[PDB]
Design a binder for this molecule. Structure first.
Ligand SMILES: Cc1cc2nc3c(=O)[nH]c(=O)nc-3n(C[C@H](O)[C@H](O)[C@H](O)COP(=O)(O)OP(=O)(O)OC[C@H]3O[C@@H](n4cnc5c(N)ncnc54)[C@H](O)[C@@H]3O)c2cc1C
Ligand SMILES: Cc1cc2nc3c(=O)[nH]c(=O)nc-3n(C[C@H](O)[C@H](O)[C@H](O)COP(=O)(O)OP(=O)(O)OC[C@H]3O[C@@H](n4cnc5c(N)ncnc54)[C@H](O)[C@@H]3O)c2cc1C
Lengths: 224, 248
């Protein structure tokens, strides 16, 4: 069973940003683990010592991004957008703690248009690491604090602009992204994160432009 | 059965170069297909069959090995790139005659790009889909050298690579390997934290693997040396020769 749930150990923790914590996880069971995919982390219910994997004892599940996966080092990285059960795991985390995770569930283009918040930053960073060096386009990020503006190495022709504001101030960013000229041929639209970012941009793209099913990734990561 | 053979249909065809044909295959059976550019077996009908008979051993299909060039789960699409030629064989016939709506049976995958700081890769058009698939997931600071042998100047194509990876194209027939081999043996190679990948025709893979075995000491796990085919021999004549090359 190569997609089974696995119990992994926190190797080390790191705060790349004030509200972005990178937790490294390890286990010999990573050797046959199946780019930037999403997993479900499985947390114990209140009262349980640990997640009960396989029915009223089932764990609480949240969806997250595989930030990085190093098979040879038996290591898997998950970045937590600090702010629920997942947030209390991310705050109280200590090395040695258990986290159960599920199995996993970027397109070639000339133009990349992306928008996200801090819950979409790991997906964007992972995608940046394998982005084609000649890529063109624009990335817009809405962070809650000016001190979570952080460095993100990009291809030379991709633009990056930060927007500091609360999840409700989807207004400077959305205006700016609706203003920019967008290519509808040989392009990839990636919208992730909060409720009020994915959907304004997704109707913006299927209003002003004719692009196909396959080249619009608009997935709300949560709902305020 | 997540690795069962699946019968796919051709969605569309595309010539990325005159002798490299990207066939895009689709099926709702691709939804649970496992996740770099792995190998697969394609199953073609025998001479007396109208179509492949998926698993009476008299109805076993002919098998060829090919690379998954790209795979898009959401779109239910899988890309295989065929090195066009005119020396015959069932896979060549499938690629030449291919129309949208044609069928192709495929196996499951049998990791390709290994973590390293230096990458040294050689191949021909049969290895270009694997090398392309591996190149587009290399880190931006990866380094190394890639040399390709193609039969015609028009089959040279863009492969965007990390800035630190050299790319050098050699035009010639599969007999004419000596310029490529001279050039690649002239390059200084890192023996630590490196991955060597040799694929394509036998007369590229074997001299390069021997060069690496003579002038450096690299563990076997950091050298890929798989001859994809052999000039003048069909897969039926070559299957066990190829096994004896790889286990040598
Ligand atoms: C495919 C996918 C990948 C994701 N990857 C990541 C990832 O790598 N890192 C990551 O941090 N998140 C990621 N998310 C988002 C993640 O699901 C949310 O952070 C999750 O809702 C928070 O879990 P929780 O148990 O702390 O909160 P929940 O109990 O689920 O939500 C409770 C409340 O928290 C509030 N809230 C305040 N700030 C936030 C916030 N930043 N995120 C969520 N809720 C918030 C909301 O009002 C919500 O109603 C991803 C989501 C998807 C769909
Ligand atoms: C791991 C692996 C991955 C491979 N991936 C690919 C891939 O992605 N794409 C791909 O095109 N091939 C790939 N190959 C090679 C492919 O299996 C051979 O080209 C195979 O011989 C093609 O079968 P055929 O039926 O067309 O020709 P066959 O019936 O095997 O042979 C007929 C004749 O044509 C010659 N010949 C065979 N193939 C070629 C060719 N490509 N160019 C010129 N002459 C040829 C033979 O030497 C023989 O004389 C791969 C091989 C391996 C081992």
């Amino acid at each position: 069973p190569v997609n089974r749930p696995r119990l992994l150990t926190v190797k080390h923790i790191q705060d790349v940003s004030p509200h972005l914590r990178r937790i490294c996880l390890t286990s010999p069971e990573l050797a046959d683990y199946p780019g930037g995919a999403h997993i479900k982390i499985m947390l114990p219910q209140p009262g349980q010592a640990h997640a009960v994997l396989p029915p009223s004892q089932r764990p609480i599940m949240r969806t997250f991004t595989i930030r990085a996966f190093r098979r040879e080092a038996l290591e898997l990285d998950i970045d937590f957008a600090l702010h629920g059960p997942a947030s209390r795991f991310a705050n109280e985390v200590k090395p040695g703690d258990l986290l159960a995770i599920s199995g996993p569930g970027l397109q070639p283009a000339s133009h990349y248009y992306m928008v996200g918040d801090l819950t979409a930053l790991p997906a964007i960073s992972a995608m940046a690491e394998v982005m084609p060096a000649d890529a063109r386009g624009h990335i817009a990020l809405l962070v809650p604090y000016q001190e979570d503006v952080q460095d993100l190495s990009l291809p030379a022709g991709v633009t990056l602009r930060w927007f500091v504001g609360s999840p409700e101030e989807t207004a400077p960013l959305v205006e700016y992204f609706t203003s920019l000229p967008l290519e509808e041929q040989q392009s990839y639209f990636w919208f992730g994160g909060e409720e009020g970012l994915v959907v304004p941009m997704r109707r913006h793209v299927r209003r002003t432009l004719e692009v196909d099913r396959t080249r619009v990734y608009a997935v709300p990561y949560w709902r305020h």
